[PDB]
């Protein structure tokens, strides 16, 4: 559907720029300070995710209702995947590189009160190291995450979504073979990377549970949620936890 050297050019050109959390690293870390900063980081990243998705070819040809649905449900996965890439490129996946001014070591993972989820996210980052994911594969795979979760009743124009998603799957397939392999080695690589994408979903589901817990207790825990974060978490996350969405896997 779209030439392989062109696709990578478009994806590189629209890739969001670095965003800082704005965290005061001179302060002592508390659960509330770290979680509020992550909430603030998510709001800042979410603004870039919308601008990014709008520039993804074919996305804005969806009905605006479906565009809302896709961003509302997939923003967690897109951000966690990009975070794993950042940790791979910056600290060789030894720490969680949420932002240049918000890097989690073991101490911050403990005081965040989601230590086990942080460990799971570092394991995801380590898969980048073991697989030696290219930047070209990363960009194609991240684009696919916009097409990873849909309502159980489907979208307004499900058929167009189906073909656009199939298209972006083909783009990943073509990028892998574009890089010199035999067809056997390219077929294994496609399975590895799609299995990597599917491994995101259990992590994302736990993160959706965790963020709804924080939101419910935000006042008592002194954990602040920015405005757009609150609008999505108070609307689409409950539907996710109610089983009203389905992940679109590969394996």
């Amino acid at each position: 559907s779209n030439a392989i050297p062109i696709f990578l050019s478009v994806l590189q050109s629209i890739e969001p720029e670095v965003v800082y959390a704005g965290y005061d690293n001179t302060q002592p870390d508390t659960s509330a300070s770290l979680l509020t900063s992550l909430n603030e980081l998510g709001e800042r990243q979410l603004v870039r995710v919308v601008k990014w998705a709008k520039a993804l070819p074919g996305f804005r040809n969806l009905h605006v209702d479906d565009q809302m649905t896709l961003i509302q449900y997939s923003w967690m996965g897109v951000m966690v995947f990009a975070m794993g890439w950042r940790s791979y490129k910056n600290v060789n996946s030894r720490m969680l590189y949420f932002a240049p001014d918000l890097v989690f070591n073991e101490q911050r993972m403990q005081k965040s009160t989601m230590y086990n989820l942080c460990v799971r996210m570092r394991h995801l980052s380590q898969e980048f190291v073991w697989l030696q994911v290219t930047q070209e594969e990363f960009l194609c795979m991240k684009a696919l995450l916009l097409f990873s979760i849909i309502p159980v009743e489907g979208l307004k124009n499900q058929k167009y979504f189906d073909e656009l998603r199939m298209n972006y799957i083909k783009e990943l397939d073509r990028v892998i073979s574009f890089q010199g392999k035999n067809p056997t080695s390219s077929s294994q690589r496609f399975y590895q990377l799609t299995k990597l994408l599917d491994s995101l979903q259990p992590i994302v589901r736990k993160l959706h549970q965790f963020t709804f817990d924080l939101f419910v207790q935000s006042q008592s825990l002194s954990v602040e949620f920015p405005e757009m974060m609150s609008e999505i978490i108070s609307a689409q996350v409950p539907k996710i936890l109610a089983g009203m969405v389905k992940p679109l896997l590969f394996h």
């Binding site: 919308v50 601008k51 605006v64 565009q67 809302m68 961003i71 405005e227 757009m228 609008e231 999505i232």
Partner: peptide, 9 residues
């Protein structure tokens, strides 16, 4: 609103 505001820009 808000997410819709960003998409309509």
């Amino acid at each position: 609103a808000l997410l819709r505001y960003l998409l309509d820009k």
